Amino acid sequence: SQVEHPAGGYKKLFETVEELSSPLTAHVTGRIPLWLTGSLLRCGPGLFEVGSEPFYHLFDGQALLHKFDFKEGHVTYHRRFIRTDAYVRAMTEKRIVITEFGTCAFPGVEVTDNALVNIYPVGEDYYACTETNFITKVNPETLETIKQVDLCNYVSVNGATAHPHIENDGTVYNIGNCIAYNIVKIPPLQADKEDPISKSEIVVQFPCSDRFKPSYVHSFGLTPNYIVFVETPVKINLFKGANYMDCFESNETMGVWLHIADKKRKKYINNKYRTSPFNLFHHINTYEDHEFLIVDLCCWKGFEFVYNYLYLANLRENWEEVKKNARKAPQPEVRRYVLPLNIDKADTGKNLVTLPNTTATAILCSDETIWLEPEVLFSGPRQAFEFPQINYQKYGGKPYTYAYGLGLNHFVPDRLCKLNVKTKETWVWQEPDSYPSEPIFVSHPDALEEDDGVVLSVVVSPGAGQKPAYLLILNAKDLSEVARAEVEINIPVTFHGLFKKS
Amino acid sequence: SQVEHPAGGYKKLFETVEELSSPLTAHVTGRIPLWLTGSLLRCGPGLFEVGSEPFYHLFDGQALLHKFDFKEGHVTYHRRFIRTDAYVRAMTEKRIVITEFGTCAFEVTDNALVNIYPVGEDYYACTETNFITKVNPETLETIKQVDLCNYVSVNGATAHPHIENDGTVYNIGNCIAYNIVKIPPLQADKEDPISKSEIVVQFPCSDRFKPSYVHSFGLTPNYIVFVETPVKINLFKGANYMDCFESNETMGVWLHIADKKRKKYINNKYRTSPFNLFHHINTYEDHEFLIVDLCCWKGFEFVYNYLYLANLRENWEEVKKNARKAPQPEVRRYVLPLNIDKADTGKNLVTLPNTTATAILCSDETIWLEPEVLFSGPRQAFEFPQINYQKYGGKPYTYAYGLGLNHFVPDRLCKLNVKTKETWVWQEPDSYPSEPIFVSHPDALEEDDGVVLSVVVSPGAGQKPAYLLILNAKDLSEVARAEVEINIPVTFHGLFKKS
Ligand SMILES: CCCC(CCC)COc1cc([C@H](O)CCN)ccc1F
Ligand SMILES: CCCC(CCC)COc1cc([C@H](O)CCN)ccc1F
Ligand SMILES: CCCCCCCCCCCCCCCC(=O)O
Ligand SMILES: CCCCCCCCCCCCCCCC(=O)O
Ligand SMILES: [Fe+2]
Ligand SMILES: [Fe+2]
């Protein structure tokens, strides 16, 4: 039944912390795997007010870069605020200078570079990002801020997502609003050794459903041969003391438009895939199965923007109020969509999904639109399987079995989940008054199976007579606890990150 | 993984049989419960050709009334063809006289092959036309033909009337609109309840000249639920009934509610994606919401297109290939809000704590529904749903029983917990069961305290060709079988008549 959080410990996820001067040694319980050698780098808000001036939204707090270093079964923790224009000017003027997602600054358009969302590699470099034109080059060893990079200096995009796809050779793919949506390709580091960002190019363009209103895009799908873009009814009103949140509106009638592009031939495919309205933030994985694309999504059922429920005032409320606030919110649901690549007019009015292992359907209509119904993989009442992660390096863009997720209880993260996407079997890790982060999968170096390895999660546990936070290591097989690295300081919410092997 | 039927035993479901002169004694294995006293009455096609003239569709074969009698742990089996106009005139002229669902004759059919239900002290076999056939539940003798058009304004009525505990019968039929018929219980005057039939409420039609096909509907103490599907009857259209059906590609599904007691249609514009619907599982009230549990087929193509006898009689590899592009079966829970507040425009109105079903209030006042999926298997349907109807029909409930269809071939019995989504399965190789009917232990306090009865075809060499199966309703564990030495063709629906 319902898991309750009356003690309200989750409030510590949204509480300001101070950065460290140097790494702290973490107290190890259990056994840190001896093959686990490298850095867990994660981004989140760390400063939720500048003096007496508050930040209002979950995505407003100033970017804090976190690092757990693993070597010979020992763990250190280090955090440094990213020296963005937003942060630097805030410390200088002792006020909010740059307008954030849901917080207007008061004394042309100074766009935020608050890189609080994710960090990803480009060539030999690492970049913290939000979803604007500004990404921040950071030192993954010292957590020092190196440089601000404006993507508009290199390619035709107004912004880019915090969820670029990274191929094994180091090629980076991303999507951004431009009205159309452009796929950016950043090549691997060449022999010439010059900045790969200076060789950035637009490979393909997706059309927009509304001439003057682009959809919000958080992530996209990538296979060896295809790019998948999901156009949601969450629209940016370009016509609109305003912040970014004030620009969003919901298109009630369009539902969801799904788009595919040939990756290698760099060409948009004019297949009009249509389905019912949902919010989409995170693609889980995409792959090719005969003449079909399998598109696994973390969906929110409805066209109301889920971000409306993520103001800090609401997330800091007592548990009964948090539950009441989420009553009319979109319902989370993991959905498998199946997109047919071969459309035969002779099959008009019929289900084109001939695959033997799915209940997903695709109806070819007379107007040539292809109406999709999903196969539901996971559905819990206001219990989201979110911040999805897979064995990305080996199974990204390919047939796969296992996804790992953060479980959201009325938007409060309170458990870690593993989903078998073929059988729909689930595993759960949960402890009372313990609020984990996105689980990141690290393979055992001699892995035979897809789930031979561990998942790493940063957990807040502020209950009296306990360590306030710890790094959790679970066995990827059954989410059984392997170890914890405990610290004696709070760690606020983190969204995304990576494991950097050394 | 996939269960296979290469031996093709399912073909015996669609093979003609002869009726019996008197009941046969069935060989009992295991133990028939001693509290199980009464008659399992079931309807199906029994004659699939008149001489050299074939019937083409699953719903064309001439109505055969089946009875398994239970008394003191002993079982008898009896079957008699229903003496309909269709059957009588066919035996007289030695040809197909009346046009059936998918077979043109070279006069509306009264071929009552679908279901049997009580009205007052009487029992009626039915199809989905204006003609129902009064039958003797003890002898299986045909008593009379009744034309519902002589009594109420309907062109037909479904084979799935709702029966309240007092014996009140509710049904729905095309009239363009859809009329709810109410037949009262038998009164002290003791005159035919059908002569007191009345239209209590009317549902509007999405298309002025094209009514939707309606197979069943939902009933609660306070509400009637009607699901208007994109499967349309083209009234403008050597034609049979199947030739009149077309799919509306754009309308999707319209859901309709009526106040049962105030006899008034409620103008709430519930809308969702296209599916075929034959069987409502159950409907109930939960605060200011209707819980609507449905056996759905995802798509607007008519599922009946896949139920021609030629296709169902094909070898197993061909049967699987034929179902590749068919609508996908899925058990769905829809939640319909009764209280629509304009202040909640653009938001999910389903505030219930135990569902992922949503209902979005749009600016045009349409309410867009998303279901909670309870059961979904690749071309594996949970169909012919049954519940503890007498005690949990129209009320909060936990358990449904179903026939499992493997590419439209019935090959297993299923139990679904609609709250937890836990399933139980009974299945044996080369065994093709019928709709499971639940019979409560007479002193049961719990919902699933009893048995389910299913008629099973098992034509494998060195085995009895058919048997009555009794499973424990708790876990679908086998309790007994009553074996017979003759074939039993497919049956659709029926009831247990306690004695
Ligand atoms: C008017 C909407 C603009 C859109 C695209 C920018 C071209 C989103 O922009 C932003 C997004 C965010 C967070 O990263 C969102 C939570 N992941 C912070 C600040 C942003 F400005
Ligand atoms: C053009 C469609 C007419 C509609 C009746 C509306 C007045 C359906 O009628 C019939 C249905 C059937 C079976 O019972 C269907 C399988 N349950 C057999 C013969 C029928 F004539
Ligand atoms: C870790 C955050 C917990 C508090 C609220 C969680 C709500 C998440 C909703 C789904 C994902 C939306 C974006 C969240 C962060 C991101 O993906 O950049
Ligand atoms: C017992 C049937 C087995 C053979 C094919 C059955 C396919 C049924 C598909 C959904 C139900 C449609 C109507 C079937 C019987 C009825 O209710 O009239
Ligand atoms: Fe994200
Ligand atoms: Fe039926």
Swiss-Prot record, chain A:
Predominant localisation class: cytoplasm
Transmembrane segments: none
Top-level lineage group: Eukaryota
Function: Critical isomerohydrolase in the retinoid cycle involved in regeneration of 11-cis-retinal, the chromophore of rod and cone opsins. Catalyzes the cleavage and isomerization of all-trans-retinyl fatty acid esters to 11-cis-retinol which is further oxidized by 11-cis retinol dehydrogenase to 11-cis-retinal for use as visual chromophore. Essential for the production of 11-cis retinal for both rod and cone photoreceptors. Also capable of catalyzing the isomerization of lutein to meso-zeaxanthin an eye-specific carotenoid.
Subunit text: Interacts with MYO7A; this mediates light-dependent intracellular transport of RPE65.
Chain positions found as Phosphothreonine: 99, 103
Family: Belongs to the carotenoid oxygenase family.
GO-annotated molecular function: all-trans-retinyl-ester hydrolase, 11-cis retinol forming activity; all-trans-retinyl-palmitate hydrolase, 11-cis retinol forming activity; beta-carotene 15,15'-dioxygenase activity; cardiolipin binding; identical protein binding; metal ion binding; phosphatidylcholine binding; phosphatidylserine binding
Cofactor remark from the record: Binds 1 Fe(2+) ion per subunit.
Protein name: Retinoid isomerohydrolase
EC nos: 3.1.1.64, 5.3.3.22
Binding site residues for Fe cation: 163, 218, 282, 496
Tissue: Retinal pigment epithelium specific.
Cellular localisation: Cytoplasm; Cell membrane; Microsome membrane
Catalytic activity: an all-trans-retinyl ester + H2O = 11-cis-retinol + a fatty acid + H(+); lutein = (3R,3'S)-zeaxanthin; all-trans-retinyl hexadecanoate + H2O = 11-cis-retinol + hexadecanoate + H(+)
Covalent lipid sites (S-palmitoyl cysteine): 208, 298-299
